[PDB]
Design a protein around this nucleic acid. Structure first.
Length: 110
RNA sequence: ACUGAAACGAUUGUUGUGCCCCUGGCGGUCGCUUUCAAUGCCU
């Protein structure tokens, strides 16, 4: 009911939680760094049976102080609907790819 | 029904493996513990 559903003829409901795409306060050149990764054989080596694995690449990451100013907006909610959604804003803490390994963010309500 | 309603490019992954700040090197060379002295005075 708060974030919505669409089955088809069997029902749909519009999201009451409105939101926008958030932007870094500073520039990309100031707000990222690129980190190499590799994946060797368990025997500790990029070589197995005398042949090299192709498993190396760079990946791009946002930095540990970058701020994303955000307005999230909730239409026509009950009091408990506001506590559920405000709950999600304070209770969830990981975003983006590779959340098993990265991507913690602190949602400071202002 | 805003070309509409809901909408994670995601999952997993070690910049890794080996490596002697190494080799050679006289704290060395010269240098007087020196210079002067009554076992003395009387029996």
């Amino acid at each position: 009911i708060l974030y919505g559903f669409a089955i088809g003829d069997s029902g749909s409901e519009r999201s009451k939680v409105y939101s926008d795409s958030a932007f870094s306060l500073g520039a990309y050149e100031q707000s990222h760094r690129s980190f190499t990764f590799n994946a060797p054989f368990e025997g500790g080596t990029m070589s197995e049976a005398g042949v090299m694995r192709s498993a190396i690449n760079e990946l791009d990451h946002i930095l540990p102080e970058v701020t994303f100013p955000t307005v999230e907006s909730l239409r026509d909610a009950t009091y408990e609907g506001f506590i559920y959604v405000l709950g999600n804003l304070l209770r969830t803490k990981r975003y983006g790819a590779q959340e098993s390994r990265t991507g913690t963010m602190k949602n400071h309500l202002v």
